[PDB]
């Protein structure tokens, strides 16, 4: 029959990292993380490829090649990070 007003039961958990070029996992040991889409990319899958895991922040080509040159439909205000939980205002 019917119930009225539905749609409120969708759960999913993903705690794994799969490359976006070869679709592997055992290579996670050398998997990189993008600071925009949180993806997984190896050092021998990119182009040009990399020598090994980077130090600072590393980004993927799927994001850089997009932000680099985009059409007139992505102009506005930047995002705003969430507050910080330090637990301990002031100091004296």
Using CB under 5 A, list all residues that contact Zn ion. Answer: 19, 21-22, 34, 36-37, 39, 42, 45, 60, 63
Which residues partner with 34 through β-bridges?
A: 58
Nearer CB in complex with Zn ion: 38/83: 38
Min dist CB 42 to Zn ion, Å, is 4
CB atoms within 10 A of CB 80: 6
Nearer CB in complex with Zn ion: 6/30: 30
Min dist CB 57 to Zn ion, Å, is 11
What would the two tokens of residue 66 be? 């997009």
Identify the CA nearest to 40 among candidates 53, 72, 87, 51.
53
């Amino acid at each position: 029959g019917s119930s009225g007003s539905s749609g409120h039961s969708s759960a999913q958990f993903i705690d794994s990292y799969i490359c976006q070029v070869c679709s592997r996992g055992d290579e996670d040991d050398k998997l990189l993380f993008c600071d925009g889409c949180d993806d997984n990319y190896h050092i021998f899958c990119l182009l040009p490829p990399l020598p090994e895991i980077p130090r600072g922040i590393w980004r993927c080509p799927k994001c850089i090649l997009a932000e680099c040159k985009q059409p007139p439909e992505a102009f506005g205000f930047e995002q705003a990070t969430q507050e910080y939980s330090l637990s301990g205002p002031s100091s004296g």
